[PDB]
Amino acid sequence: ASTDYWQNWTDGGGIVNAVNGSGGNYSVNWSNTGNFVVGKGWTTGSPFRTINYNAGVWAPNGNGYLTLYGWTRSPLIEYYVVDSWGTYRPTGTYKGTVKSDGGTYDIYTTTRYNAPSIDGDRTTFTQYWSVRQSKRPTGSNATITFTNHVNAWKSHGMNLGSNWAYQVMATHGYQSSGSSNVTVW
């Protein structure tokens, strides 16, 4: 599946040398960071998607997520399905779990008041996450069957927006340094 959205955000601090290359291929060389996100994919998120990535470099120095990343509206919801990471494995309020794509994922919700969004500014939104338990191997062809996670959340009072925004396989950071070459499709 040929991708159409490209994401390259940075709060401004440190370095994010993010290269948009051929098709679904992207890469990031970051050093001394604050906040940043990079990701290829689609401009309207679907909950029916099957995402295909292949992390060929995944070398964090600290707090990172190789995570499915996306957004919705009515209500504003920033969500994740984290397949791996560097030093810190994300969490929040446990609801349950869910098997998909070989991994079992923990379910969590977190509240963020005063912080950017696809509206911008400092504001609130709720965050649904599915967090893998082991760190999923990189290197080879991975698959995020996402309906699985949307059906999951839904049985946990985690419903999502009527209005779909961007949905990308992303490289997430917060005051870390490191490296990633992924390819999405």
UniProtKB/Swiss-Prot annotation:
GO annotation terms (biological process): xylan catabolic process
GO MF annotation terms: endo-1,4-beta-xylanase activity
Q: What pathway, per the record?
A: Glycan degradation; xylan degradation
Q: Which InterPro entries match?
A: ConA-like_dom_sf, GH11/12, GH11_AS_1, GH11_AS_2, GH11_dom, Glyco_hydro_11
UniProt-listed Pfam families: Glyco_hydro_11
From the UniProt record, list the reaction(s) this protein catalyses.
Endohydrolysis of (1->4)-beta-D-xylosidic linkages in xylans
Query: Does Signal count among this protein's keywords?
Result: yes
The alphabetized UniProt keywords are: Carbohydrate metabolism, Glycosidase, Hydrolase, Polysaccharide degradation, Signal, Xylan degradation
PROSITE patterns xrefs? GH11_1, GH11_2, GH11_3
Give residue ranges for domain GH11.
1-185
Q: What is its EC number?
A: 3.2.1.8
Please name the catalytic residues of this protein: 78 (nucleophile), 172 (proton donor)
Please give the superkingdom of this protein's source: Bacteria
What general EC class does the enzyme of this chain belong to?
hydrolase
Give the family this protein belongs to, as stated in its UniProt record.
Belongs to the glycosyl hydrolase 11 (cellulase G) family.
Query: What is the protein's name according to its record?
Result: Endo-1,4-beta-xylanase
